[PDB]
Amino acid sequence: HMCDAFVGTWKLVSSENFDDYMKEVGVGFATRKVAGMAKPNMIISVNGDVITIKSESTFKNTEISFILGQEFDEVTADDRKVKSTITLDGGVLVHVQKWDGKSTTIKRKREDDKLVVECVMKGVTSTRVYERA
Numbered sequence: 345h346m347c348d349a350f351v352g353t354w355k356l357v358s359s360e361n362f363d364d365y366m367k368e369v370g371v372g373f374a375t376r377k378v379a380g381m382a383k384p385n386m387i388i389s390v391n392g393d394v395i396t397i398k399s400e401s402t403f404k405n406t407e408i409s410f411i412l413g414q415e416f417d418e419v420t421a422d423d424r425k426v427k428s429t430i431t432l433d434g435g436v437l438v439h440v441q442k443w444d445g446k447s448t449t450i451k452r453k454r455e456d457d458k459l460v461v462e463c464v465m466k467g468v469t470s471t472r473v474y475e476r477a
């Protein structure tokens with residue numbers, strides 16, 4: 345029942361500062377502009393200990409499956425090859441990606457009827473709000 349309140353299909357409804365987050369991460373111009381238009385779906389499911397998070401969009405479909413606390417390989421939407429670890433901390437899913445000596449942290453939180461996602465790279469934070477689809 346670890347992630348019960350996260351399970352579902354979630355659609356992006358708002359984004360703030362995501363272009364600047366992407367710049368800080370190192371995403372190139374064309375990817376930033378195209379990615380910035382999209383309203384992706386985030387589809388979260390759980391089977392035993394395995395959590396699956398799918399992202400479906402006009403740009404890219406991708407998917408991660410993982411066990412909390414257990415590092416895995418991830419290809420990001422902007423084509424970074426990262427080493428990811430996702431944990432639960434006080435009911436927040438905390439996702440750390442490591443690549444090329446860099447690190448970014450992505451938090452997913454249930455707040456009211458929304459899923460609030462905060463992405464941080466150095467001093468830049470972005471907030472993306474998703475609603476049930």
Ligand SMILES: Fc1ccc(-c2c3c(nc(N4CCCCC4)c2-c2nnn[nH]2)CCOC3)cc1
Nearest residue numbers: 379380382384399401402403404421422450461
């Ligand atoms: F069409 C799309 C598809 C994917 C993304 C996208 C990107 C990146 N990180 C993301 N997430 C945010 C939610 C939590 C995980 C990190 C997304 C995303 N937004 N919604 N789902 N995934 C990194 C940079 O490249 C794009 C943006 C537009």
